[PDB]
């Protein structure tokens, strides 16, 4: 549990911050549900939005079979 973005005073998840983003994607590049990491709903939507932006820039992979 323990949504980490509220405890860190986060206001945006900043798709450029790829170190944070890799803690929310599976080993196959799938976004981990907030039910598993205990993320708040508002920040989970920002998280999914940031991950997809990172995928478009080729910072993160869409899948494990690229």
């Amino acid at each position: 549990k323990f949504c980490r973005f509220t405890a860190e005073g986060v206001q945006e998840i900043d798709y450029k911050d790829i170190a944070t983003l890799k803690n929310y994607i599976t080993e196959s590049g799938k976004i981990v549900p907030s039910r598993i990491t205990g993320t708040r709903a508002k920040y989970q939507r920002q998280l999914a939005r940031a991950i997809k932006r990172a995928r478009y820039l080729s910072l993160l992979p869409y899948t494990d079979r690229h």
Partner: protein
């Protein structure tokens, strides 16, 4: 589910880690869900029915902790 075999690891342990990695991603679950078309009216219906039974069983489990069988 890309699995790398490690040194001094027996094959069965390596193979067992492959199942756990595949079942974690649910690749066989996605495929079976995708082999036939699901109408949007019936995917909403099965999602609605899955939520109601997870709710119903919880109250059935809660009320069992307030009930004695003998």
């Amino acid at each position: 589910p890309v699995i790398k075999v490690r040194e001094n690891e027996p094959f069965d342990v390596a193979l067992r880690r492959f199942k756990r990695s595949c079942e974690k991603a649910g690749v066989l679950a996605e495929v079976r869900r995708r082999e036939f078309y699901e109408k949007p009216t019936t995917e909403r219906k099965r999602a609605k029915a899955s939520a109601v039974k997870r709710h119903a069983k919880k109250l059935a489990r809660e009320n069992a902790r307030r009930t004695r069988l003998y």
